[PDB]
Enzyme design. Structure first.
Site, PDB file in Angstrom:
ATOM      1  N   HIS A   1     -52.929  16.050  -7.567  1.00  9.67           N
ATOM      2  CA  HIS A   1     -53.836  17.043  -8.183  1.00  9.67           C
ATOM      3  C   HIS A   1     -54.211  18.082  -7.111  1.00  9.67           C
ATOM      4  CE1 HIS A   1     -56.252  18.802 -11.171  1.00  9.67           C
ATOM      5  NE2 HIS A   1     -57.405  18.473 -10.574  1.00  9.67           N
TER       6      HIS A   1
ATOM      7  N   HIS B   1     -54.081  26.576  -9.027  1.00 15.84           N
ATOM      8  CA  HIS B   1     -54.618  25.636 -10.027  1.00 15.84           C
ATOM      9  C   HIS B   1     -54.520  26.330 -11.382  1.00 15.84           C
ATOM     10  CE1 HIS B   1     -56.547  22.700 -12.156  1.00 15.84           C
ATOM     11  NE2 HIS B   1     -57.605  22.441 -11.372  1.00 15.84           N
TER      12      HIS B   1
ATOM     13  N   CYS C   1     -58.717  20.533 -17.070  1.00 11.71           N
ATOM     14  CA  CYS C   1     -57.513  20.509 -16.191  1.00 11.71           C
ATOM     15  C   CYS C   1     -56.488  19.449 -16.637  1.00 11.71           C
ATOM     16  CB  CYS C   1     -57.845  20.235 -14.721  1.00 11.71           C
ATOM     17  SG  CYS C   1     -59.511  20.721 -14.218  1.00 11.71           S
TER      18      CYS C   1
END
Lengths: 399, 238
Positions: free
Chosen positions: A292, A326, A167
């Site tokens: 995040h 995401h 990520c």
């Protein structure tokens, strides 16, 4: 004897983006303000067995891969080509001004052409003919293909590589390009990355009990995990002054767990502190933090604790992953791109979505936006916390 | 162009693990690997731990741990062209066969699982990066290591590795492509002991991995040696 004494900062010159909010920066800016992502909806054929899944998709018709570059013919590279077309004049100017050897191409991805690899295995195993028209090449599935493709396409002879740190991949790409310019190896860098929808991450996150089948709710009471999306972002970094500066970068590793965060957020704190000290600013000088905020129980708990510790309760912050999803390897550069749009287009700050289950009452106060509001300071932060405990913090500012 | 010091190393490939094996091999031309030669066991990992990592990852974590036990390092960079291709292939087969995916297999399929697992096993909260750049993963990854030295990391552990390429892929890779597991670990520092300059080449898909081309030339001790890449070459000088 005496001699005459008369005998560097990195800036963002251009950004190209595609994600669930739109096919170009104009449409993304509008839809971000409206809080609606036309690409975010339930899609069949991804989540086994025979389930539908809310996903952030790019539905745009993508530019064709030139047939002399068919070894690189992935949706991943066509998404990068679509982003490149948005900034092509600026990229062409950089190559002409500095030369082919003094440009870098630093990408990040967690997928590359993983969907093409999936099609290849299934089509081969079952000798499928009709469903598939795709000319597969192994190069399409390689994690180095994003930077290899762009370097070949543009004839860039400077450093060219792809970060694959889950990520944080495309935010690490921004850090590495910034440093190659600081070092004097190049004058400009094309940075960012792309990830594309694949059954492998969708079913993998389901196996971790970390996939929300319904749209994610970062920092909310009923949150049940992530919503996956796809995105491409290219930023042109340069030593030549531009309206937006890359003020600060920060990096750390938790050394704790392969998929769960440090429970005390030690790594997140280290990355944020490093970015603030590079920028030479205090927590009080940040106008907005793009969190995040993935919608997992563990991520959002840890992050609320870290922001409460460093910033207290009065720094506006939100996760936009309820709009984009995401985007995995693409998340770092996608969210840096959204932060660049907030600054350059003077957009209102995006609220956290509390319209469904409402805020998690166990989390400390950390300035989560309950409504949109103007940016009061011209400095923004974007954080990414990845598998392998890999953390980044980026700070952008009006020059 | 880049300049650096290399102050230590640890490597494993088919038939090559002991210092004397590497030194004898560096004296032999051409530089070549016999994929039928056995790999030594991991020396720093319990066998259960080693056998749960993939064929290349276990070598890369083991070589990295060996150097972490000898040195205080400031940052870690891992490089791999194919990454966790064995795990990726297993998961794509799970999807084709409508079988459950192992959550651990999925979590360990990320390219940075090797460097991440090293930081966890060594209790080493150090800046970590993981790079892929096709044939040139080793040479381009040295630029990532140099960015970390530039940013103030004095000693950078650098590990290039591959796992075995599954037989499934042998018909879609070049006939020359190496298919065996190996790892090369280097301890990098700021300095000018070595310089490297990139040039155009007519060669591609080298039969020997870049990090093993490098180790051969570096151990052999000649003033100049070349590492071949994807229509490029890398001119090393001492």
């Amino acid at each position: 004897m005496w001699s005459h004494p008369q005998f560097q900062g990195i800036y963002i010159s251009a950004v190209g983006m595609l994600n669930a909010l739109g096919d170009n920066v104009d449409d993304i800016a509008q839809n971000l303000v409206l809080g609606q992502a036309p690409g975010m909806y339930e899609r069949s054929g991804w989540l086994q067995p025979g389930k539908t899944c809310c996903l952030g998709g790019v539905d745009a018709e993508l530019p064709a891969m030139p047939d002399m570059l068919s070894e690189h013919n992935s949706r991943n590279n066509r998404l990068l080509l679509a982003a490149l077309m948005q900034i092509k004049p600026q990229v062409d100017e950089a190559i002409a001004r500095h030369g082919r050897e003094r440009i870098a191409v630093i990408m990040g991805t967690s997928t590359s052409g993983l969907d093409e690899g999936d099609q290849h295995v299934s089509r081969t195993v079952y000798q499928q003919s009709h469903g598939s028209y795709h000319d597969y090449h192994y190069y399409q599935q390689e994690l180095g293909d994003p930077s290899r493709f762009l370097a070949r396409y543009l004839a860039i002879e400077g450093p060219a590589f792809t970060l694959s740190t889950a990520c944080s991949s495309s935010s690490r790409a921004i850090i590495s390009g910034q440093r190659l310019i600081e070092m004097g190896l190049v004058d400009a860098a094309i940075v960012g990355g792309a990830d594309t929808l694949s059954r492998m991450p969708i079913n993998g996150f389901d196996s971790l009990e970390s996939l929300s089948p319904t749209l994610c709710e970062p920092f909310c009471q009923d949150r049940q995990g992530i919503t996956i999306g796809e995105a491409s972002t290219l930023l042109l970094l340069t030593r030549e002054p531009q309206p937006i500066a890359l003020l600060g970068v920060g990096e750390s590793s938790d050394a704790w767990h392969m998929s769960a965060p440090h429970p005390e957020g030690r790594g997140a704190i280290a990355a944020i502190n490093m970015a603030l000290r590079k920028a030479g600013i205090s927590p009080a000088e940040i106008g907005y933090i793009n969190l995040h905020g993935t919608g997992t129980k563990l991520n959002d708990q840890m992050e609320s604790i870290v922001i409460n510790q460093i910033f207290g309760e009065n720094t506006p912050c939100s996760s936009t992953k309820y709009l984009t999803g995401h985007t995995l390897g693409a998340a770092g550069a996608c969210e840096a791109g959204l932060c660049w749009l907030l600054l350059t287009r003077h957009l209102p700050l995006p609220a956290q979505d509390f319209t469904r289950s409402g805020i998690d009452i166990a989390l400390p106060a950390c300035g989560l936006l309950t409504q949109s509001q103007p940016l009061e300071k011209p400095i923004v932060m974007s954080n990414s916390f990845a598998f392998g405990g890999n953390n980044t913090s980026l700070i952008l500012g009006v020059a | 162009k880049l300049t650096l010091d290399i102050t230590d190393w640890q490597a494993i490939a088919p038939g090559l693990s002991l210092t004397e094996e590497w030194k004898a091999w560096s004296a032999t031309l051409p530089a070549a690997i016999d994929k039928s030669r056995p790999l030594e066991k991991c020396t720093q990992l319990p066998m259960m731990t080693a056998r749960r990592l993939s064929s290349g990852s276990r070598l890369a974590v083991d070589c990295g741990l060996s150097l972490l036990r000898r040195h205080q390092v400031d940052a870690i960079v891992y490089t791999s062209r194919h990454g966790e291709l064995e795990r990726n292939y297993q998961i794509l087969q799970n999807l084709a066969q409508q079988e459950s995916i192992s959550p651990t297999n999925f979590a360990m399929s990320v390219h940075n699982s090797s460097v991440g697992n090293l930081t966890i096993v060594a209790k080493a909260p150090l800046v970590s990066s993981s790079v892929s750049a096709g044939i040139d993963s080793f040479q381009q990854g040295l630029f990532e290591a140099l960015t970390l030295i530039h940013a103030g990391h004095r000693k950078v552990l650098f590990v290039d590795f591959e796992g075995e390429i599954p037989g499934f892929y042998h018909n879609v890779i070049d006939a020359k492509t190496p298919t065996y597991p190996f790892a090369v670990a280097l301890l990098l520092e700021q300095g000018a002991g070595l310089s490297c300059t990139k040039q155009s080449s007519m060669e591609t898909e080298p039969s020997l991995p870049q990090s093993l081309q490098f180790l051969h030339g570096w151990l052999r001790g000649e003033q100049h040696f070349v590492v071949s890449g994807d229509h490029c070459q890398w001119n090393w000088s001492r």
